[PDB]
Input
Amino acid sequence: QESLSSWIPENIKKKECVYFVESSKLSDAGKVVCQCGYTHEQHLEEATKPHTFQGTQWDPKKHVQEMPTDAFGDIVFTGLSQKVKKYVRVSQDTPSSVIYHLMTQHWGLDVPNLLISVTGGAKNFNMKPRLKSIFRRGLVKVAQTTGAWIITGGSHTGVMKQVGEAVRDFSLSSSYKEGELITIGVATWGTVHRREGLIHPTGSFPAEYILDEDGQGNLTCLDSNHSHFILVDDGTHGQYGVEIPLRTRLEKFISEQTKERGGVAIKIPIVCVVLEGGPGTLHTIDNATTNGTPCVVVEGSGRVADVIAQVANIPVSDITISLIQQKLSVFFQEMFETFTESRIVEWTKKIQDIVRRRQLLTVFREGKDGQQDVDVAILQALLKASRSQDHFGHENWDHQLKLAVAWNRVDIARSEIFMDEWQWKPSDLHPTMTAALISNKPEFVKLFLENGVQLKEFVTWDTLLYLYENLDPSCLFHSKLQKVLVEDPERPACAPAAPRLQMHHVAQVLRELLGDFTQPLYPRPRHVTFTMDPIRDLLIWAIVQNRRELAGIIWAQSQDCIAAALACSKILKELSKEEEDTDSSEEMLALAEEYEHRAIGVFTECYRKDEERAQKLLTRVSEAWGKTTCLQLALEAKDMKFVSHGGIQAFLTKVWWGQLSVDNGLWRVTLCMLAFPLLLTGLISFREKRLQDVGTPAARARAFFTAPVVVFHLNILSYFAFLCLFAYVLMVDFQPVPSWCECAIYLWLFSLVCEEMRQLFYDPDECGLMKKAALYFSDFWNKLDVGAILLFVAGLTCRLIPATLYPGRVILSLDFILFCLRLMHIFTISKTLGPKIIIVKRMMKDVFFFLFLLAVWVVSFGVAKQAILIHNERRVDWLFRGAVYHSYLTIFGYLLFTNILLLNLLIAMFNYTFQQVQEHTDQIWKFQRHDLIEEYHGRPAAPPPFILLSHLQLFIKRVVRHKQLKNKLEKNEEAALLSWEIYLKENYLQNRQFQQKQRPEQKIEDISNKVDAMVDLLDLDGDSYHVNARHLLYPNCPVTRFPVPNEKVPWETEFLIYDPPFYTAERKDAAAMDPMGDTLEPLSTIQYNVVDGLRDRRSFHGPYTVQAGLPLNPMGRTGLRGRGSLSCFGPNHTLYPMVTRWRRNEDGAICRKSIKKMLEVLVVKLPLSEHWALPGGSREPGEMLPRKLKRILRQEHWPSFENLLKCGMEVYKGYMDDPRNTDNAWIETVAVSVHFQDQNDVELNRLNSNLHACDSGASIRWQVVDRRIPLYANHKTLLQKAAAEFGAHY
Amino acid sequence: DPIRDLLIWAIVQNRRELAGIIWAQSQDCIAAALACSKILKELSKEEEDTDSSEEMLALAEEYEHRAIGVFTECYRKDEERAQKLLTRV
Ligand SMILES: Nc1ncnc2c1nc(Br)n2[C@H](O)[C@H](O)[C@H](O)CCOP(=O)(O)OP(=O)(O)OC[C@@H]1O[C@@H](O)[C@@H](O)[C@@H]1O
Ligand SMILES: Nc1ncnc2c1nc(Br)n2[C@H](O)[C@H](O)[C@H](O)CCOP(=O)(O)OP(=O)(O)OC[C@@H]1O[C@@H](O)[C@@H](O)[C@@H]1O
Output
C-alpha cells in the first residue's frame, strides 16, 4: 500500500478532452454534453480557455490529451459482501507490459497456468436449468483446479453477469481457498453509473460504491462478484468500443509470457468461450481464431453461438448466401427487418472461415455427445489445437505432457496424452518426472513409473544435485543446509562471492541427524555416474521434507528394507523434536511410528520363512547406510516395538548363552558353577552337537568362561562374598593393625572401579568424553555405585583413627546399607522380576512424602505421650531417651490411624500408578536388556577375585567391536540374502494391501464410490477456390478488404454489391512496372498473352479475361482491387525450386514410416518471417532466375554450376494461392525437383561444397516431409503435390 | 458486537440449530462459547422440568467442547499469543 500508491500515477495516465467544442447535438435535456459528452459548457470540465489555437472542431489525436491517472484503490460495494476488490483506471496507450507488471507484482496475483477468456453478448438472456448448472460447474471446476485467470467484462448484464453468478456459486461452498477464483474485469470507465464517488486523487482507498439497476440510461453498472477491475479511459461519455482493442492486445501479450516452475517451461495456453453474442462477437471469435486460440462456442440459447452450432459440422462451402440468410431469418425477430443486404456478407464470410477450420472451432454439444463437466471439454479442445500446432522433432508429445503435468488432472494425461501418438521411449519421460517429483505430484509419478521409467535409472549425480537444490523452501532441512553451506570456509576460498552447493553438504547434516556412528553417506570430493544403491538417496530426499505419499512409493522398491525402514524412522524422530512446530512436528512423529511398523512387518515375514537366515540379516554391516547394522539403528532410534518382537529376543537370549544350548535352565547352571567338577559328566546341555557327541575336554572347560552368563554368575557371587566379608570385619575384625581383610576390602572395592575404567573409557561409536561423563551421571544406579565410594569418603579417616567409635560406626553401617541397595540391581536379568524392579524404581518416589505423612504424626503422638506424663520438667537428655522409647513402643504396637487411615492412602498411591503399566513395562525392560548383554559380552572372562591376570595382560596388546553383534558377510552370499529379502518384502507388501482393502470402512467407501458413477450414468441417459487469398485484413495494410463469399467469388457469378477500396501499395513507383494504383490514366501498355520485355505478361494459366485495362484475376474475385503488394501490375511469374531426397537411416537405406517413404527436403527461413519457405524468389533477371532466387544461398559461382546443372523434373506449373493476390495481380509458380538416388557422391557433395549461405541470414537446413511441417499455408501445397513424385507419405 | 445479543436470544430459549448457526460468525468465540455454557448451566438447574432441564444441561456440555476445540486450535499455532487471549478483559 506504500509502494503501490507510488507506482500508478506517474507512469499510468488518463485521456482528457482539452479543447472546448460546444454542443453540436443536445440530448436528454442536456447542453453540457458536447461531442465526447462530459459536463460543463465545454467538451470537458477543464478550464474554459481558448486552449491554444482555436481550430474549428476536434480530432481524436489533436485534441485528446493524456495526463496522470487520479482514480485507484480498493472498491467496496456497500453492504453487498466485505471483500475489498482492487481497481485501476487506464487509457488507450498503455503498453501491456505495464499492466502485466502491475497485476503480477503490485496487485499480488500469480502467473496462471491457463488464461480462460469469457466474451459474450450484453443483451440479457435466460437459459435452461440443465445447461445453466452444467456451465456453472464446468467453469468453476476448470478455473479452480488449474488456477486460471477468468478475464472478462465488468458489466452486470449478460455472460459476464453469469460468470459473476458462478463465482458467487463457488463462494457459496468455498471448501478451501475461497478467494482463489480471481476474475479480472475489463470495462469502459466512461460508462459507469456511480463513478463520481471514485474520483479521488492520491489514493481512493475503500471508496464505497452503490449499484442501482433500472436507474441508468444506456450506461452500465459494475458487478459485485468479480475480484479485480481495470477500467479504460477515452475522454468519452457513451461509447462501448474502447475496451475490446486493449483487451485483445493485453490477452495476446499474456500468452507470450512463459511460466517456468520445476524445470519445465511452457507458454501459457489461451482459450475462449462465448454465449449468445451479438454483432461484436463475430469480431472476437474471428480475432481469436485467426491467431490460434481454441474458441469454444456452446450450443444452446444462442443468437450467434447457436448459429455456429447449427452450421457447425455441415461441410465448408456447401452453404449458400441465401441459405445463410434463411438461417438468420429464423432467429432474429426483433431486428429481422433492419438487416441490410450488406450485413449478410460480413456474417457469411466470417462463418465461412470459422466453420471452415474445425480443428480450432469446437462445438460443445450440450447434452448429445461429449457432455462432460465442460472442464475436460475445454481442456480437450485446447490440447486439440496444441496438437494442431507446428512440430518438427517430436515436440507435440513432450509439450502436451509438460502441460498436463503443469495442470493437476491425471485423467487428461491418461485419456488424451498417454494413450496416443505412439513412441514415448521410457527415457523420454525423465524431464517431466523431475518436475512431478519436485511439485509433489504422487498420481503423476505413479503413472510415469507405470509407463516404464525405472527408479534404478533417472537418479543420477546431476539429477540428485538438481533435486536437492530445489528442495521445499520452507523446511528445517533447507535452513540447516543453508547454514552448513555458508559456514564452511574453504569452500568459498575459491570464490567467496557465490556459494556453491556440493554433495558433502547434505551428507554432513545427514550424519548429524542420523548419528555419529555412521561414516558419511556421500564421499567427500577429492557423464552420468550413478552412486551405489541409487534409490536410498531419493528415499532420503523424500523422507526428510515429510512427503508421505512419495515416501511409500519410493520405499516400495528399495534394496534393503529393514535398515532403510529403521533409518527413515531414526531420521524422522531426530528431526521431529527440534522443529518448533505442532503440526509437522506431530505429523513426522507419527510417520516415524509407521515406518517402525513397516520395518517390523517386513522382518516377521523373514522370521517365518527361516530361523537362522533371519538373524544373519539382523546383524550384518550395511555398506549403503553408513557401515552400521540393522540392530544398532533400532536400539539407538528408541524403537520400542522392534527390539521386543520375539525374533529379536530369541537372538538376544542366544548370545546371552553363547555356543551352548538354551533349553537347560538356571538351576542346572548354578549347580554346575557351584560344583567345579560337574561339567565333564552328562549334566549340562549343548547345541551344535558336533561338540556335544565328540566332546573335547579342553573346549568344554573354556566354553563356560567364554559364556557371559557364567561371568555374570561369578560376578554376583564374588560381590556377595565380598559384602559378607565386609560384614564380617564390621562384626569382629576391627583391629588398629589392618585386619587381614582391610587391604582386601580396599582391593576388592577397587575391583568394581577397575571395570568402570572399561565401561566408561570404551566408545564403540565416536562420542565425546564429556558426553560420556554426562551419560554416566544420568544413571541413578551408577550414582549409587559411585555413592559407595562417596560414603567411603568419610570411612577412610575413621579407619585411620579408630578411636572415633561412637561417631564412626554409623558411616560404615550406612555404607553397608548402600551396598545392599546396590545389590538390588541383580534382578534385571530375572524375566519375571526384571520389569518388576523397573516399576519399583518409579515406585520409590511416593515414599519420600509418605514418610512425611507417617513419621510426623507418629512423632507427634509420641510427643503427646510425654505430655501426658508430667507437664513441666527440664531434662533434655532423659526426655530424649523417654520419647525414643515411647515412639518405638507406638511403632511396635496408634492402631486407629495406622491400619485404617494410612494403609489405604498407601495402597491407593500404589494402585493408581500400578494401573495402566502392564503394556509398557515389558517393552521397556526388553529394550534395556541389550545394554547389559553387550556389557557382559565385552567383559573379561575371569572372576573378579582373579580378574587381575587379564587386567595385567590387556596392556601388551595395546602397547604393541566384536563379531557377535556386528560382522561383515561375504558379498556373494549377501547378494542372495538381499534377493531373499526383496522377495519377502514384495510378499509382505502384497499381503498388506490385499488385507487392508478388506476393512469394513474401506468396503463401505467402495460401495459409496461405486454408486456415484452409476447415478451419473442414470442421470445422463467443399469448394476448391482460393481461401488464404480471401482472408480479411490484407497483410500490413490498414484498410480491410471487402468481404467476398465463396458463393460469388468467381467473376462470372452474379454479384451486385461490389465496392472494394482501391488497393494502394506503399511505393508503386519504384516497382519498375506501371505505378498506376488507380486506373484513371491507362499509361500501362501490357501485351496480353505476349511477352512485353522487362515485364512479363504471359501467364501459365492461359488467356485470362481483360476488362477496363485492369487484368482480372482468373481464379475469381479476391475482394480487393488495386496496385497490391505484388511488384508488377498484373500477373507476376516465379519459380520455386525444391531439393528432395529420401531420408536415410544409419544403414543408408530409405526410411519407412507406416504408410510410405520419408522425403528429405531442404528449407530456409529468415528470422523476420517467423515462417519457413523454399529458397525461391521473384525472377528479377530474365536470363538467370536462380541468381536472384537464391543469391543468399549458394554462391552465384557454385550457383553458376547449379544453373549448369539446372535440368530436373517439372512437378507443378499454374496458378498459386497467395495472400497478396488482388483482383489485378496474381502469382503463378514453377516447381522443379531434383532428386538424389544414392548418397555416396555427386550432387549431394556438390551442394555441400557449394555453400556460401554463411554470408548472412539464418541457417539452411534439411527437413522431413510431414503434415505439421512449418511452412506457409499454401506454399506447402507445392510440396504436397511433390509428394506424388516419389511415393511420399505426407 | 451486534451478534452477541442475537446469540443470547438464541441460547436462552434453548434453540439448538439456530444457536450453532448464529455462533458460527461471532466476534470472540472462547468468551462467548463459555458464557453460553455458564448461562445454560445456571438456567438449567431451577427450571422445574426433566425434558428441557436435561436438554440444556447437555447443550452446555457441547458449547463446552466448542470452546475447548477452538482454543486448542489457537494453542497449536502459537504459544505466547494463545494465553494473551486467555487473560484479556
Ligand atoms: N458490457 C457491454 N459490452 C458491450 N456492449 C454492451 C455492454 N453493455 C451494454 Br447495455 N451494451 C450494449 O448493449 C451494446 O451496445 C450492445 O450492442 C448492446 C447489445 O449487446 P450485444 O449486441 O448482445 O453484444 P455486442 O454488441 O456484440 O458486444 C459484445 C462485446 O464484445 C466483448 O468483447 C465484450 O467486450 C462485449 O460483450
Ligand atoms: N508463400 C509466400 N511467399 C512469399 N511471401 C509470402 C508468402 N506467404 C506470405 Br503471408 N507472404 C508474405 O510476404 C508475408 O506476409 C511477408 O510479410 C511478406 C514478405 O515479408 P517476409 O516474410 O519477410 O518475406 P517472404 O514472405 O519470405 O518472401 C517475400 C519475398 O521478398 C519480397 O521482396 C518479395 O519480392 C518476395 O516475395
